[PDB]
Every structure is written in C-alpha cells, then in structure tokens.
Scaffold this active site. Structure first.
Site, PDB file in Angstrom:
ATOM      1  N   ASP A 197       0.813  -1.206   0.000  1.00  0.00           N
ATOM      2  CA  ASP A 197       0.000   0.000   0.000  1.00  0.00           C
ATOM      3  C   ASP A 197       0.855   1.269   0.000  1.00  0.00           C
ATOM      4  O   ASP A 197       1.895   1.345   0.665  1.00  0.00           O
ATOM      5  CB  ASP A 197      -0.832  -0.027   1.284  1.00  0.00           C
ATOM      6  CG  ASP A 197      -1.755   1.147   1.417  1.00  0.00           C
ATOM      7  OD1 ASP A 197      -2.705   1.232   0.624  1.00  0.00           O
ATOM      8  OD2 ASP A 197      -1.551   1.966   2.343  1.00  0.00           O
ATOM      9  N   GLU A 233       1.758  -0.551  -4.880  1.00  0.00           N
ATOM     10  CA  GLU A 233       0.740   0.414  -5.270  1.00  0.00           C
ATOM     11  C   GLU A 233       1.406   1.772  -5.397  1.00  0.00           C
ATOM     12  O   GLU A 233       1.699   2.436  -4.396  1.00  0.00           O
ATOM     13  CB  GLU A 233      -0.398   0.483  -4.260  1.00  0.00           C
ATOM     14  CG  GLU A 233      -1.489   1.424  -4.781  1.00  0.00           C
ATOM     15  CD  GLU A 233      -2.242   2.212  -3.719  1.00  0.00           C
ATOM     16  OE1 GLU A 233      -1.740   2.394  -2.585  1.00  0.00           O
ATOM     17  OE2 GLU A 233      -3.365   2.673  -4.046  1.00  0.00           O
TER      18      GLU A 233
HETATM   19 CL   LIG Z   1      -3.971  -1.466  -5.784  1.00  0.00          CL
END
Ligand SMILES: [Cl-]
Ligand SMILES: [Ca+2]
Length: 496
Positions: A197, A233
């Site tokens: 993340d 990400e």
């Molecule tokens: Cl994602």
C-alpha cells in the site's frame, strides 16, 4: 540485488483476484472454486491489527490504519488466517497480503482490532512498539498542517502525512527491522507475496532496505530459493515528481494508466475509439507489461478516488461496459491481471463525491462481516461472473501466443486472435456487424464462451442466452454475427 517482481503459479493458472473485505473462512472455502476455475491467487485485505473506527460505523478504510503487526483483523483471527493460507496453498491458490507499511493511524486515540492501544496525537503504538522517534515529524515536513499538498515535491510526498496518517520513518533501522519481521512472519506461514500500500509515499531506498531483510518463500509449497512476490501500489497518472519507473527494479508496480485508458476507451469518452487499442500497452505511455500489475478497477477508484472521479473508471455499477473492458484485458497480453471482487454499498454521488464511500462490507452490525453469498445483492463476486471466469479460461488457453489477426472497423469494432488458440470479436458499435475474418483457429464448431458454458458443443445454456454455434471454416476464417447490446462480444477458443 534481489528482484521481487516474479510470481509463482500452478500450471495453467495466472490471474489473481482481490477478495476485498472477505473473511478468512470465506476465502478458505473460495480457494476450491478458484482452483477449479484456474485462478492463481488472492489478494487479501490488510490482516494485521488495524484501527477500529466507530464514527462512522466500521468503514472499510479503518483497515488502512495499522495499530500493530499482530494478526487479528476484521477478516478473522490469526488461527483463521493460517487455516486459510494452508488450505489455499494446498489447493495451489496463493495468498498476497495487502501490506500497509507507510503509516500507522491518523490522529486520535483508541484501540485496534486486537485490543492494543493507538494514539496518533502522542505517536504511541505500544503493540509494536513505536513512539515519536519512529515517525517523520516537524523535522522532516514543513507544511503548515503536516500533510501532503504539493505532488511536484517528492520530499513532501514521501515525508509528510497522507491525509494526516502518521508517517513512519522508513529510513530508521528499527522501523525497517519491525516491518520486515511482520512480512517474514507471514512468509513463514506460507504467504506468497504482498500488495504494498501507498508506495508512492515511501522512498524506493527504504523499500529496498526492507525487501533485503525478507526471507525466501516457504518450501512446503514454493520452490527453494524464491523471493516473495511484491507488487507496489504507486498511483502515477503522469505529471508528478514520483514515477512508477522508480520502483520497477524492486518489483512489479500497479499501472493505474491501464484502467484509466481502457475505461475512457470503452466509455468512448472525448471521442475515444475501440480501434485505438491496436497498440495498447507500453506504447500508450505505460509501464512494460513485465513490470505491471493491471486491473480495470480497485477498491479505491471504484469509490471515485481516482482521477476523473466517477467519469472514467469502469466498475460493477457499469456492468456491461465493465465486462467488455475486462474481456479485452484478459484476452490481450499485457501485465499481470488482477480482477476486483466487490461488495455493494449505497453509492450516492453528490457534487462528484460519493457521500457513502466509507461504508464497509456487508455486516449485521458491530463491525463483523457477513458470510459471503454471491449474487445476493450484497456480494458482487465479479470473479464468479461467467463472462469473467470464461475469459480467464480464454486467457489461460491463449497463454504465450502473440496477438494475431487484428481487425477493426476504423471505429468501435475490433477483433483479434491469440495464435491458433483463441479469437475474440468485440463490437462496441450501436449497430450489428456481420464479418468474416481469418480467426487463426483450426476448422470446427466453437461456442461463444461469453454467453455459453463450454467452448464446443454441447454449448451449455446455464445463462439462458447462449448464442448459436460459430463455424470456423477450413481456411481458418469464420463469420461473426455480433449484434450490439448486452454482452456484444463473441470469444471462441480451442479445447482446454
Ligand atoms: Cl492497488
Ligand atoms: Ca511516507
């Protein structure tokens, strides 16, 4: 230097699914279905101890505010997590953990999902433990509110707080050791990799130091000497000072341009044409396919948080167009494909923003999550839609073949094959098309796998609208009669 962008799948499997907010007991059961349909693996929601937010009541985003690295979460206990990993691994369907390493909580105090305290005001996380020395602060960020505002300033993007989330000092040896211990514990249980993340908010050098501490995969299931799979990400739609290409040396990167571009094309936004996909991929200004994790939508941008808001990304709310875009993505050869799997919520767009974008998964209350029942109006289960899973089968059958026999109508109809294995005709016009094309396929009788259950007669009519059989002639040509409307596509392929 270790590279983490290679993933490991059983033969004949490749596509992964984000089972967003599914409980561990449900994912454990789903692995049988996923194996039977030759999906490779599952991205699971953050499984570590996260914030419990009661105002508003139990939003999905509480799981993106870590409180500690213990393993009791909304999806279930450590015991349930380990049962899931073991069962899924034994079925050859692997687990990628949504790993939240950039930050802890926002401001305020309370407890997490395992009972440990957090205090974003004093920066005290006794379940780790972390204190103020483990975070960026006024020494590292000079904005008036401590948050990120200037995305042309990499130092601000990486050292200030994303929307107030207290920002960990990833340069600190202690933080690197603690985060690697968390990842290594999960690898030791059998986790195959991580969706990392908020990587645009971390320094690649800090990620490199954390990844260098990782142990290799558990050889109960995985080959000896194999690094975990890492996909990062990084939200990069261009025109910012942080670039996806900074992270590809470490592992794969989410290519958000892919869903933006396919969304605009299938929607025909601003005069776009399906015929423009003839060269789709890296040549559109995107990452190379080998560096990319690709997807039509994710949990954030299906809630309007990506660029264009609600006007570009395709989601289950635009189901017909979403299936067209997903079918194209699965039939093409570009990137590691992840399919979103969603729940329904009372989306309520006012002035371009969904007022209810906080709503968590189906729940009876009390922060629990209901057992999944697909197609009940609450769980969407896109990965179980026939148009999706039969195009996953198409993708698997087509693997390793080039794009061949491309055709288009100059406008909104394209057709192409994958070697001599499969062929898809996509008619995105507002009129019907009858067109004979070299399909590259052996002569014979094929069924449209978009509308039918099987690839050859008997075609299977479980959906009720299985189309007439497609005859491929002895020269490899076939006549496609593709009306416009719902499921305005035909896909045919050789027997698996
Ligand atoms: Cl994602
Ligand atoms: Ca940061």
């Amino acid at each position: 230097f270790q590279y983490f962008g290679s993933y490991y799948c059983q033969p004949g499997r490749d596509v992964i699914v984000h089972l967003f907010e599914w409980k561990w007991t449900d994912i454990e059961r789903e692995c049988q279905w996923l194996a039977d349909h030759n999906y490779c693996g599952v991205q699971v929601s953050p499984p570590n101890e996260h914030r419990i937010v009661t105002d508003p009541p139990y939003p999905w985003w509480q799981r993106y505010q870590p409180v500690s690295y213990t393993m009791n979460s909304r999806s279930g206990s450590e015991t349930q997590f380990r049962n899931m990993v073991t069962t899924c691994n034994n079925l050859g369907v692997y687990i990628y953990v949504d790993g939240v390493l950039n930050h802890m909580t926002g401001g305020g105090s309370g407890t997490g999902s395992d009972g440990n305290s957090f205090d974003g005001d004093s920066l005290q996380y006794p379940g780790v433990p972390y204190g103020p020395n483990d975070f960026h602060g006024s020494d590292d960020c000079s904005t008036s509110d401590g948050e990120i505002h200037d995305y042309n300033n990499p130092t601000e993007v990486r050292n200030c707080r994303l929307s107030g989330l207290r920002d960990l000092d990833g340069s600190a040896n202690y933080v690197r050791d603690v985060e690697a211990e968390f990842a290594n514990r999960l690898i030791g249980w059998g986790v195959a990799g991580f969706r990392l993340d908020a990587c645009k908010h971390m320094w690649p050098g800090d990620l490199e130091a954390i990844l260098g501490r990782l142990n290799q995969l558990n050889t109960q299931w995985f080959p000896a000497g194999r690094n975990a799979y890492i996909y990062q990400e990084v939200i990069d739609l261009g025109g910012e000072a942080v670039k996806a290409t900074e992270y590809t040396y470490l592992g794969r990167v989410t290519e958000f341009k892919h869903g933006q571009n396919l969304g605009n094309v299938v929607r025909k936004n601003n005069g776009q044409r399906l015929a423009n996909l003839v060269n789709f991929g890296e040549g559109w200004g995107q990452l190379s396919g080998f560096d990319a994790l690709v997807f039509i939508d994710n949990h954030d941008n299906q809630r309007g948080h990506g660029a264009g808001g609600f006007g570009t990304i395709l989601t289950f709310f635009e189901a017909n167009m979403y299936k067209i875009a997903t079918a194209f993505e699965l039939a093409w050869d570009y990137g590691h494909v992840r399919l979103m799997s969603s729940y329904n919520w009372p989306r309520n767009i006012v002035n371009g923003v969904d007022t209810n974008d906080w709503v968590g998964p189906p729940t009876n209350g009390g922060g629990d999550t209901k057992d999944v029942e697909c197609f009940n109006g609450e769980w969407i289960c896109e990965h179980r839609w026939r148009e999706m899973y039969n195009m996953v089968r198409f993708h698997n059958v087509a693997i390793g073949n080039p794009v061949s026999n491309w055709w288009d109508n100059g406008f909104q109809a394209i057709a192409f094959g994958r070697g001599n294995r499969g062929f898809i005709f996509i008619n995105n016009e507002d009129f019907a098309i009858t067109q004979t094309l070299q399909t590259g396929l052996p002569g014979g009788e094929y069924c449209d796998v978009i509308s039918c259950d099987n690839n050859r007669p008997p075609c299977g009519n479980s959906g009720g609208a299985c189309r007439a059989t497609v005859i491929v002639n002895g020269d490899g040509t076939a006549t496609f009669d593709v009306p416009n409307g719902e499921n305005p596509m035909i896909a045919i392929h050789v027997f698996l």
